[PDB]
Design an enzyme around this catalytic site. Structure first.
Site, PDB file in Angstrom:
ATOM      1  N   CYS B  86       0.829  -1.217   0.000  1.00  0.00           N
ATOM      2  CA  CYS B  86       0.000   0.000   0.000  1.00  0.00           C
ATOM      3  C   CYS B  86       0.858   1.259   0.000  1.00  0.00           C
ATOM      4  CB  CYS B  86      -0.989   0.074   1.165  1.00  0.00           C
ATOM      5  SG  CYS B  86      -1.866  -1.464   1.373  1.00  0.00           S
ATOM      6  N   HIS B 345      -9.572   2.183  -1.998  1.00  0.00           N
ATOM      7  CA  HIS B 345      -8.170   1.899  -1.684  1.00  0.00           C
ATOM      8  C   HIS B 345      -7.502   0.974  -2.695  1.00  0.00           C
ATOM      9  CE1 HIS B 345      -5.076   2.530   1.307  1.00  0.00           C
ATOM     10  NE2 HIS B 345      -4.733   1.257   1.223  1.00  0.00           N
ATOM     11  N   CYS B 375       0.103   3.104   5.940  1.00  0.00           N
ATOM     12  CA  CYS B 375       0.587   1.879   6.536  1.00  0.00           C
ATOM     13  C   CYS B 375       0.799   0.879   5.395  1.00  0.00           C
ATOM     14  CB  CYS B 375      -0.388   1.334   7.592  1.00  0.00           C
ATOM     15  SG  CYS B 375      -1.939   0.629   6.927  1.00  0.00           S
ATOM     16  N   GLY B 377       1.372  -3.372   4.427  1.00  0.00           N
ATOM     17  CA  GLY B 377       1.387  -4.782   4.795  1.00  0.00           C
ATOM     18  C   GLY B 377       2.795  -5.324   5.008  1.00  0.00           C
TER      19      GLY B 377
HETATM   20  C1  LIG Z   1     -13.468  -5.608   4.374  1.00  0.00           C
HETATM   21  C2  LIG Z   1     -13.724  -6.555   3.210  1.00  0.00           C
HETATM   22  C3  LIG Z   1     -13.271  -7.973   3.555  1.00  0.00           C
HETATM   23  C4  LIG Z   1     -15.205  -6.598   2.855  1.00  0.00           C
HETATM   24  O1  LIG Z   1     -15.373  -7.062   1.549  1.00  0.00           O
HETATM   25  P1  LIG Z   1     -16.913  -7.509   1.124  1.00  0.00           P
HETATM   26  O2  LIG Z   1     -17.842  -7.745   2.467  1.00  0.00           O
HETATM   27  O3  LIG Z   1     -16.806  -8.815   0.382  1.00  0.00           O
HETATM   28  O4  LIG Z   1     -17.518  -6.272   0.175  1.00  0.00           O
HETATM   29  P2  LIG Z   1     -18.991  -5.521   0.427  1.00  0.00           P
HETATM   30  O5  LIG Z   1     -18.802  -4.045   0.189  1.00  0.00           O
HETATM   31  O6  LIG Z   1     -20.053  -6.104  -0.685  1.00  0.00           O
HETATM   32  O7  LIG Z   1     -19.632  -5.763   1.952  1.00  0.00           O
HETATM   33  C5  LIG Z   1     -20.732  -6.651   2.105  1.00  0.00           C
HETATM   34  C6  LIG Z   1     -21.983  -6.051   2.784  1.00  0.00           C
HETATM   35  O8  LIG Z   1     -21.770  -4.980   3.804  1.00  0.00           O
HETATM   36  C7  LIG Z   1     -22.389  -3.744   3.298  1.00  0.00           C
HETATM   37  N1  LIG Z   1     -21.780  -2.520   3.781  1.00  0.00           N
HETATM   38  C8  LIG Z   1     -20.513  -2.205   3.629  1.00  0.00           C
HETATM   39  N2  LIG Z   1     -20.314  -0.900   4.149  1.00  0.00           N
HETATM   40  C9  LIG Z   1     -21.538  -0.440   4.609  1.00  0.00           C
HETATM   41  C10 LIG Z   1     -21.927   0.741   5.231  1.00  0.00           C
HETATM   42  N3  LIG Z   1     -20.971   1.805   5.475  1.00  0.00           N
HETATM   43  N4  LIG Z   1     -23.197   0.909   5.584  1.00  0.00           N
HETATM   44  C11 LIG Z   1     -24.115  -0.054   5.364  1.00  0.00           C
HETATM   45  N5  LIG Z   1     -23.739  -1.229   4.755  1.00  0.00           N
HETATM   46  C12 LIG Z   1     -22.454  -1.402   4.395  1.00  0.00           C
HETATM   47  C13 LIG Z   1     -22.848  -4.031   1.918  1.00  0.00           C
HETATM   48  O9  LIG Z   1     -23.661  -3.142   1.188  1.00  0.00           O
HETATM   49  C14 LIG Z   1     -23.093  -5.483   1.905  1.00  0.00           C
HETATM   50  O10 LIG Z   1     -24.401  -5.923   1.990  1.00  0.00           O
HETATM   51  P3  LIG Z   1     -24.733  -7.399   1.378  1.00  0.00           P
HETATM   52  O11 LIG Z   1     -23.802  -8.504   2.168  1.00  0.00           O
HETATM   53  O12 LIG Z   1     -26.341  -7.722   1.582  1.00  0.00           O
HETATM   54  O13 LIG Z   1     -24.376  -7.369  -0.088  1.00  0.00           O
HETATM   55  C15 LIG Z   1     -12.998  -6.078   1.943  1.00  0.00           C
HETATM   56  O14 LIG Z   1     -13.446  -4.846   1.469  1.00  0.00           O
HETATM   57  C16 LIG Z   1     -11.508  -5.976   2.235  1.00  0.00           C
HETATM   58  O15 LIG Z   1     -10.811  -6.933   2.214  1.00  0.00           O
HETATM   59  N6  LIG Z   1     -11.040  -4.635   2.613  1.00  0.00           N
HETATM   60  C17 LIG Z   1      -9.710  -4.514   3.188  1.00  0.00           C
HETATM   61  C18 LIG Z   1      -8.582  -4.366   2.172  1.00  0.00           C
HETATM   62  C19 LIG Z   1      -7.212  -4.055   2.770  1.00  0.00           C
HETATM   63  O16 LIG Z   1      -6.823  -4.697   3.687  1.00  0.00           O
HETATM   64  N7  LIG Z   1      -6.323  -3.214   1.997  1.00  0.00           N
HETATM   65  C20 LIG Z   1      -4.968  -2.950   2.443  1.00  0.00           C
HETATM   66  C21 LIG Z   1      -4.715  -2.715   3.946  1.00  0.00           C
HETATM   67  S1  LIG Z   1      -2.978  -2.371   4.395  1.00  0.00           S
END
Ligand SMILES: CC(C)(COP(=O)(O)OP(=O)(O)OC[C@H]1O[C@@H](n2cnc3c(N)ncnc32)[C@H](O)[C@@H]1OP(=O)(O)O)[C@@H](O)C(=O)NCCC(=O)NCCS
Ligand SMILES: CC(C)(COP(=O)(O)OP(=O)(O)OC[C@H]1O[C@@H](n2cnc3c(N)ncnc32)[C@@H](O)[C@@H]1OP(=O)(O)O)[C@@H](O)C(=O)NCCC(=O)NCCS
Ligand SMILES: CC(C)(COP(=O)(O)OP(=O)(O)OC[C@H]1O[C@@H](n2cnc3c(N)ncnc32)[C@@H](O)[C@H]1OP(=O)(O)O)[C@@H](O)C(=O)NCCC(=O)NCCS
Ligand SMILES: CC(C)(COP(=O)(O)OP(=O)(O)OC[C@H]1O[C@H](n2cnc3c(N)ncnc32)[C@@H](O)[C@@H]1OP(=O)(O)O)[C@@H](O)C(=O)NCCC(=O)NCCS
Ligand SMILES: [Cl-]
Ligand SMILES: [K+]
Ligand code: NA
Lengths: 389, 389, 389, 389
Positions: B86, B345, B375, B377
């Site tokens: 990142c 991101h 930050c 990884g």
């Molecule tokens: C966190 C993570 C695992 C989630 O991925 P995901 O759950 O598969 O993606 P989604 O956005 O579809 O989230 C799923 C659900 O939560 C919801 N949701 C997410 N944010 C929301 C919010 N602010 N308010 C309301 N609902 C929310 C969705 O709309 C969704 O509903 P559904 O399950 O009925 O479809 C993923 O985004 C990820 O890995 N992020 C981290 C990446 C990272 O580490 N980068 C580098 C770091 S150094």
């Protein structure tokens, strides 16, 4: 200002050979440990590891950091990888030198590492395949060896160069056999011993120590070479015999300021006097080392005739020939110990590999001024000038 | 000494969304053209392109070069990609600065690019599989988001940090909601318009112009945030809602000496006065920004109180909260237009993406002293100090 | 002598539709229970289940056993699957009949099941792929729909029949529309109600009752039909609209002697008076029904004029028209409730599926003699004569 | 009134050995041509070919019709495959017998074929994989070797039986050693020469002729048997040594009426006097041969002591002992030339493979009555009684 305190490389392994199942970072860790040991420098003291690597897919987060951590470089240090194709291993060294030149670090380990054998096949599947066959893409070929603008293999760029320079199949094969014969003689006389650090391939039913370059043919014949079929063009001239190989290895250098080496009482392998990188037509990428070497020399204030030793990477007999012809340096000082046609060509590591070969031959023969250069897919070259202390 | 002449980014795309089938180099090409256009610098004048990119598998040889050539950067220039996770897109800029500072180039384009959507699944198949099922690995998860030493997601490192710093779920959610609300206001007021360059998504039955950040949620509620389930640990506190997203995009800056911009009549977005990268424990990589920012400030000769604006990358509410608590800078000057929880991101690009947001906000409000940090990884941070001219 | 005590079939699902994620054996189990329930026969009285199925890859040992066991048939009974491509579903019933006729069994459940939606992609990887791209092969297409001798789609074999019987595009559109119209007619008239047995698609976010043939398009007009482009030849005649679809489904019958049925006070849907399978040129595979139909008829000592009802599988408009013209039977008693073009063509199940329709339609209208026939890829046909009691 | 006019089989190949890259229908075609030649019957006289086969994925439409065609059987005939798992190869013969018994056919070729080597890995990928690794499933293990209801390997059902019968490791090893020694002796003394037809492995670098079973270990000892570790249960009794192998091969028989053979001057190998198939608990599937053999003998009117020779498939030393133990037939007439532990166990062909061994041994020793039987995953058994003419 900046010296190479120490260097090391693994033997180069054959494609799916000695290191067929060895992740690149394991190779890198061994060379990192080796340069620290050879310099009398503790891993605690390293500020950053910079490793060229063209094919890391499937290896996990930032293999450079995995290598450094395995070698016991502290968590407070940093690590990153970079990719300028086959220029990577040498460019990393010039990049490492810049960290010290700008006062941002004191001690750098830089070089490259590559496992072409562990390179995977891949496919983008998030959308799904409703119906029909689809392709699993060999990342080694796609991301390593195919030109992104023309869609053909590096070997085709070699053909292009052969045609433009009018280099016969016979001339290319003579070059190839000489490279093999030089490398055999060097291996047999023990000229690769100083630079190689052994690598232990851990195996449940036995650990094997790998400490010789396994790709080098013993007693290669011109007749068997002349027999081969063109590998990229049915009426071409480039064959498996007169092309570099697909290979595995790592290679690195420990850098610090001349003053720092002095305080530590280290007798450095060389001073980095200059480096350069320039682009050329993707279609004739093998020509990169020409403008790259000429710029490096100009930056060094050196004439071609000032050089005592040269390592010009043998991506293909065709391109190495053209490079030598245009630069016109004495071929008797070029690839004195054989080159990639015999030794092999682990892409991200290769530039650091020939740097190791250059530095250790310069030391053994008392050569004062040297140069390493490589060609780069997509149309580039990199070169670096090295002067003995 | 070295200034940022100009900068640009694409809109940040949602996972499998607007840029679902757009290779990163196409986004990069657009951003390279934009920085050139904004500085009044012709592509012919560029010496080298340096692009952070964590997930290039399957895209072909050296996407940085593909991006540069597509933007009309001449074949005589060079290009390479690099990978500090990142941290990449920001480290790429510090590296570009060093090219000029050491006198090896005059004009650099530097930033990052990433298509997490287009990242393939892969497997190493060269040795065959004699028997037994085997995994098709997600390169995004494996090479992007999984810690190589502990084998768990970045989201688990976020949990570790939340435990150590004792940050409630409720606290993380409030931070998350605030990010969303700041980002929506900034978007609606047009604060991202300066920095974004539109990207034309070529479509058989219709080209589509993407010029808005599509991941930003409009009207995000605390109650919906609070009903989400923990995404990494069943009794955890990190959710999809209070973590950063998986996204696509690119961002860059054009670099040259201060005396160079002056000769050209260019009013730079800022002067790069220092940068730094330091390591920390992989387990709590999200704390990366603490020693990096402190080191950057020390090098700059600045107190934390001297800063007028800050961009601290929001990988996870948990770690962003920890970062702010420890450094103690006024939170009202940090991510004033929102950050990654709302904006997205795209790993390789993110560091240049927040650099863009900082530069255009600094210009807009007359802020004199800025800092960007992320930050990384595997346990690292990177930070850069920028002063207005 | 041998009778069909009872019959049942699932609704036929569209490709990646109602049953997109339902394993064939689940569909098998529903049908097995339905025939038992309908004849008032305990599962423990089944000697053997015989299910045709062309695409079992990935489903686990002997899907016919899996279906049988889920349907309640005890462990003591036996089960097996068989593949004669599109003839399977019907052939299995012939085989079932043969078990009883040779005195080797008393009671059989026989039919077919297929989930072309659940058919996976595959590659042979045991020896490994040393270098270069390879193909992931769609088993539905490779093992299901591609002639193994000429290497083209069953669509081309129909094109082959189109040019040999000189059938025009419009002449196949006409056939296609009339099938759709008939299919919609029977559906809305509730003529598929008896044969169909509902299937419950379980789910985390809901349970779904599937009891309607979803692939049937309502309000089919010639307009849209003739606006389709050819599917297998740049300037051919066969299209999506005039060829069968890709579909999921299961179908089965319960067999026993005429005496047995009597002892159990069952009123049988009919009696199997003959059957036959013959081979033809792979190129013109669609013609299969012509010789198998005459053979079965000759074996039963009937004339074509004796027939009161005929089900002739609509693999393609081209082949169906060809068979109807060659055989010379009355076009107004053929596929009364419409055919596969409109209903769907779940390969393994189709022969049992059309047998159900035949059986329930015969009963509804008081038809005495009946015939079911299908063409088979690789060049084969299969036919069976059914007489009411 | 049905006789086996002739029979043949390929040698059985070691896993990824002699036939590593040889598609099943190729082995199948060789065996079909052979039984034609041996019986003096013209291919144009064959009504149908029936081939057992469990692992056809990716081999294309109906490998059975491929075999029949390559073997030279005319397009006019028919062909199909069927799956009763490990019993498929013998069931095929019983099904072909019924074709003639009911007067539907005059001349059948029936048996089975398997290439456990060529079986591919697969994945259902139509919906697409948004994120996350996924499994590429080894169809050999999944559809061939794993119980669909309990999820564990046949090797585990084997342990169940062993514990059930209290068969010691030593005991199973003693059985293993005999089977190897018996096979070695048979091989060397020429006893397999009659049944085996040679197969030519076409190869760029030269053709190779295979006519010997390559899986048999020469000089097998209790010593070596004892050193082996449990293959499925960490404290189990089953090892690679007392368990059958994974293998490739094919086998078949030409079937016709006894009066037809006499018309032709043919001296048949035997008359099919009966067959039978029965279910048992999948957990102890290896017991299947007990009810199957007893029902067959009952249907034949034979007392167990009437048997002169016996082939009882050696899926595992565990189940084999159990079966032998229950039935109590003289061990010296059981698997006289060895069994599957030494010879190999090519699933779909296996039942026709042991039918060949039996038939040919019955002739050279003058045996009058013989029985063949095999266990079946999913918990079934099959058996067949043969009488010399
Ligand atoms: C966190 C993570 C695992 C989630 O991925 P995901 O759950 O598969 O993606 P989604 O956005 O579809 O989230 C799923 C659900 O939560 C919801 N949701 C997410 N944010 C929301 C919010 N602010 N308010 C309301 N609902 C929310 C969705 O709309 C969704 O509903 P559904 O399950 O009925 O479809 C993923 O985004 C990820 O890995 N992020 C981290 C990446 C990272 O580490 N980068 C580098 C770091 S150094
Ligand atoms: C048992 C089984 C799982 C093992 O497969 P495998 O480990 O790949 O085969 P191997 O022979 O290479 O086993 C490993 C070792 O034991 C050996 N071995 C086996 N029998 C031996 C013997 N009699 N003497 C000495 N060594 C022996 C070696 O060949 C070998 O050493 P290596 O790994 O250094 O080469 C497999 O053969 C199998 O599944 N068999 C049953 C199939 C089945 O269930 N069919 C249907 C049942 S109804
Ligand atoms: C014919 C075949 C190749 C087409 O499959 P397909 O094109 O992938 O199916 P699709 O979902 O893409 O629909 C096809 C297209 O024509 C249409 N179409 C088909 N029938 C139509 C009709 N009656 N009226 C109007 N439009 C129609 C569209 O729905 C269109 O898709 P669109 O939404 O992009 O406009 C396929 O169904 C098949 O293989 N048939 C033969 C199967 C077979 O051979 N089995 C064994 C026989 S021996
Ligand atoms: C050229 C290339 C495709 C060939 O790889 P390969 O097909 O695996 O070739 P191999 O090493 O297996 O050898 C192939 C044949 O010629 C051989 N061969 C190679 N060199 C030989 C020699 N000097 N003398 C005799 N035989 C030789 C044989 O061993 C062999 O015959 P066989 O395997 O049928 O028994 C590959 O090495 C390559 O792509 N090299 C270029 C990589 C490159 O572009 N890197 C970066 C450039 S910027
Ligand atoms: Cl790298
Ligand atoms: K890299
Ligand atoms: Na067959």
């Amino acid at each position: 200002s900046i010296v190479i305190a120490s260097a090391a490389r693994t033997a180069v392994g054959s494609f799916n050979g000695a290191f067929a199942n060895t992740p690149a970072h394991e190779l890198g860790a061994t060379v990192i440990s080796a340069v620290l040991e050879r310099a009398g420098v503790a891993a605690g003291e390293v500020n950053e590891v910079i490793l060229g690597q063209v094919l890391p897919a499937g290896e996990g987060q930032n293999p450079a950091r995995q290598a450094a951590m395995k070698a016991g470089v502290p968590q407070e240090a940093t690590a990153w990888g970079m990719n300028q194709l086959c220029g990577s291993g040498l460019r990393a060294v010039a990049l490492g030198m810049q960290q010290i030149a700008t006062g941002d670090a004191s001690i750098i380990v830089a070089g490259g590492m590559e496992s072409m054998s562990m390179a995977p096949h891949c496919a983008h599947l998030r959308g799904g395949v409703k119906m029909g066959d689809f392709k699993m893409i060999d990342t080694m070929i796609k991301d390593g060896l195919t030109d992104a603008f023309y869609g053909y293999h590096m070997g085709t760029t070699a053909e292009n160069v052969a045609k433009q320079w009018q280099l016969s199949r016979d001339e290319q094969d003579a070059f190839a056999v000489a490279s093999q014969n030089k490398a055999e003689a060097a291996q047999k006389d023990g000229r690769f011993k100083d630079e190689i650090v052994p690598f232990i391939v851990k195996g449940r039913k036995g650990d094997i120590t790998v400490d010789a370059d396994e790709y080098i043919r013993h007693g290669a014949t011109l007749d068997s070479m002349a027999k081969l079929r063109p590998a990229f063009d049915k009426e071409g001239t480039v064959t498996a015999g007169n092309a570099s190989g697909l290979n595995d290895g790592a290679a690195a250098a420990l850098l610090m300021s001349e003053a720092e080496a002095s305080r530590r009482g280290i007798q450095p392998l060389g001073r980095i006097v200059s480096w350069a990188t320039v682009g050329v037509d993707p279609k004739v990428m093998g020509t990169g080392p020409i403008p790259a070497s000429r710029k490096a020399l100009e930056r060094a204030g050196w004439k071609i005739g000032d050089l005592d030793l040269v390592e010009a990477a043998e991506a293909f007999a065709a391109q190495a020939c053209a490079v030598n012809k245009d630069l016109g340096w004495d071929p008797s000082i070029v690839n004195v110990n054989g080159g990639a046609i015999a030794i092999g060509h682990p892409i991200g590591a290769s530039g650091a590999r020939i740097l190791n070969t250059l530095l250790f031959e310069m030391k053994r023969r008392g050569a004062r001024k040297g140069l390493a250069t490589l060609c780069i897919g997509g149309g580039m070259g990199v070169a670096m000038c090295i002067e003995s202390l």
